[PDB]
Write a protein that binds this ligand. Structure first.
Ligand SMILES: Nc1ncnc2c1ncn2[C@@H]1O[C@H](COP(=O)(O)OP(=O)(O)OP(=O)(O)O)[C@@H](O)[C@H]1O
Length: 295
RNA sequence: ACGGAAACUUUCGUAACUGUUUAAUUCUGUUCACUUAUUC
């Protein structure tokens, strides 16, 4: 499998509320875009039977600035791995920056566990604008933008085949998150040849102090042993559904999954949960497959 | 089958009303058109 490289600028990626926005984005945001364009193109009965093929998976948002970036491990270092806090004045001034850290570089994935505390590089500044609506007198909303600079890209790793190359190629001329009606979500698809020789520790078999990402959800069956002696971080993601027959826009059920970079100790399974409020002619399904890293 | 769908910071209104580039001011102070000469 290969990987896709794309960048964003002057876009919008909300989180929780329409007026609020963040830098990265969840993993289920990409999967919800390929299904919408499959019915419009003419292959709805072909993309549904491809995502549930086990070997086909997706990733979350990862920055790309002169090298790939990886999230920090949750829980590391522990109380014994970290150095002894002899002087509390010199430890509290550097331990707070590790909690607010976003992502780590590709050359610091092996030295962070031995003792390395530094400030993360600033990706982009948060910019916001304002609009209104004349001929109404009674509407004033606030929206934000994600204007990236200093060469900031958000690559994605998927399973390259003879059908995926024709699906995500037309996505750059559309939108992905934020105000799509204005033109927030366009990117530039860039393909290469030989992937990175360093980030090749992705497997789904053994479980020897691994770490699952992509903000996946564990299976409903095995959970007592997988969650035991582990860590996670609950998030928040909800919203209305996409349909054309219903005239009420029902609110979908929330799916408080985990976060990226959560360490565990047992191989998960990764199933497909069905979320249906009342009734819909289509089918709302969740993806987010876990990906383990050897660390 | 996307915290996404739906949206003009819009209409508004001479940078304007009075004001001599002028007040003071001899293109003139000195200056033979001439030295020499029988209309017989
Ligand atoms: N009066 C108090 N008694 C006990 N604990 C306190 C009191 N005031 C604050 N704290 C503790 O201090 C913590 C907040 O620390 P704070 O964020 O102010 O550190 P900081 O000033 O940012 O550190 P630095 O200056 O190194 O950045 C809280 O978790 C709280 O438990």
């Amino acid at each position: 499998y290969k990987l896709y490289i794309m960048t964003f600028q002057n876009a919008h990626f909300g989180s929780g509320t329409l007026d609020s926005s963040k830098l990265t984005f969840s993993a289920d945001r990409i999967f919800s875009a390929l299904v919408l364009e499959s019915l419009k193109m003419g292959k709805l009965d072909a993309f549904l039977a491809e995502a549930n093929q086990d070997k086909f998976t997706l990733t979350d948002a990862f920055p790309f600035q002169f090298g790939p970036f990886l999230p920090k491990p949750i829980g590391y270092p522990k109380h014994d791995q970290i150095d002894q806090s002899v002087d509390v004045k010199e430890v509290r001034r550097q331990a707070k920056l590790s909690k607010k850290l976003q992502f780590l570089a590709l050359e610091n994935v092996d030295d962070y566990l031995n003792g390395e505390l530094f400030e993360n590089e600033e990706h982009a500044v948060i910019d916001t604008v304002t609009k209104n609506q004349p001929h109404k007198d009674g509407n004033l909303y606030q929206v934000a933008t994600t204007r990236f600079s200093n060469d900031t890209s958000l690559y994605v790793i998927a399973n390259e085949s003879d059908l995926l190359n024709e699906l995500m190629s037309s996505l750059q001329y559309s939108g992905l998150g934020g105000k799509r009606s204005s033109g927030f979500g366009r990117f530039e698809l860039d393909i290469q040849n030989i992937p990175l020789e360093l980030s090749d520790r992705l497997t789904k078999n053994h479980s020897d102090k691994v770490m699952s990402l992509t903000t996946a959800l564990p299976v409903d069956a095995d959970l007592e042993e997988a969650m035991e002696d582990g860590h996670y971080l609950l998030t928040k993601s909800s919203g209305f559904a996409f349909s054309h027959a219903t005239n009420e826009n029902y609110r979908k059920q929330d799916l408080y999954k985990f976060a990226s970079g959560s360490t565990f100790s047992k191989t998960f399974e990764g199933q497909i949960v069905d979320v249906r409020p009342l009734d819909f002619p289509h089918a709302v399904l969740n993806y987010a497959k876990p990906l383990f890293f050897k660390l």
